[PDB]
Write a structure and sequence with these properties.
By secondary structure, the protein is of the alpha+beta class. The chain has one domain. Helix content is about 30%, strand content about 25%. Strands 1, 4, 5, 6, 8, 11 and 13 form a seven-stranded antiparallel beta sheet that branches. A hairpin with an 8-residue loop joins strand 2 (about 55) and strand 3. It binds the ligand Cc1cc(NC(=O)CCC(=O)O)nc(C)c1Br and fe (iii) ion. The ligand Cc1cc(NC(=O)CCC(=O)O)nc(C)c1Br binds near residues 123, 126, 156, 171 and 187. Its cofactor is Fe(2+); L-ascorbate.
Length: about 220
């Protein structure tokens, strides 16, 4: 689909109704696999962190580490398709502008590329923006070809505010996910038993981020 049709006819109404929106086959197999290739290249060349310290043993050789991070601006050599992805996310958001909540999105973060190494680690339940830091939408792109969560785990489980039920999102290849970043969407990553990659950017609301800057401060000489 074109960004505009998908945004107007699916993403906006879905986000406003549920605060979670799943878009399958966002870029298609060729581009998706190119992104996968770049992400794996970054991994294989050591551009990721060693991963979140999960268990700190008395000894450190047996330390267990979870999700590995790298921040990608999108102009880096070898990250050209990632930059293409980020631009396509941005086009999708731009063609929603004004219609997602009352938010006026005026910026985003760089891309946080995560790699769960497949050793059983996941990510604890949390809220992305609990303190009013300006992030209003979480956007995640999944690159894991033929992911079977029944075997490999790694479901993102969201606990939408004031609902008994979970929303389980499998980290399926070429899948794009949006959710409100605030307390309406606590979530966790269930233990991943295979290598799981995802690419996250957060979009800022202009007003929230403007007054976050006020409360959190940016110093000029007298
Ligand atoms: C380090 C860090 C990771 C995440 N990632 C996820 O919630 C997982 C989404 C997915 O991969 O499905 N969120 C925050 C607020 C921080 Br900080
Ligand atoms: Fe999160």
């Amino acid at each position: 689909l074109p960004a505009l049709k998908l945004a107007l006819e699916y993403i906006v109404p879905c986000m406003n109704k549920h605060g979670i929106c799943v878009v399958d086959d966002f870029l298609g197999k060729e581009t998706g696999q190119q992104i996968g290739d770049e992400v794996r290249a970054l991994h294989d060349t050591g551009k990721f962190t060693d991963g979140q310290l999960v268990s700190q043993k008395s000894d450190s050789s047996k330390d267990i580490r979870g999700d590995k991070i790298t921040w990608i601006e999108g102009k880096e050599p070898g990250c050209e398709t990632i930059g293409l992805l980020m631009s396509s996310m941005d086009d999708l958001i731009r063609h929603c502008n004004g219609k997602l909540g009352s938010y006026k999105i005026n910026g985003r973060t760089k891309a946080m590329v995560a790699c769960y190494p497949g050793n059983g680690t996941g990510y604890v339940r949390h809220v992305d923006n609990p303190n009013g830091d300006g992030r209003c939408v979480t956007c995640i792109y999944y690159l894991n070809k033929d992911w079977d969560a029944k075997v490999s785990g790694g479901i993102l489980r969201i606990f939408p505010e004031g609902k008994a039920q979970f929303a389980d999102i499998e980290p399926k290849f070429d899948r794009l996910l949006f959710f409100w970043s605030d307390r309406r969407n606590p979530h966790e990553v269930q233990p991943a038993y295979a290598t799981r990659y995802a690419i996250t950017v957060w979009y800022f609301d202009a007003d929230e981020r403007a007054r976050a800057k006020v409360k959190y401060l940016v110093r000029v000489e007298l």
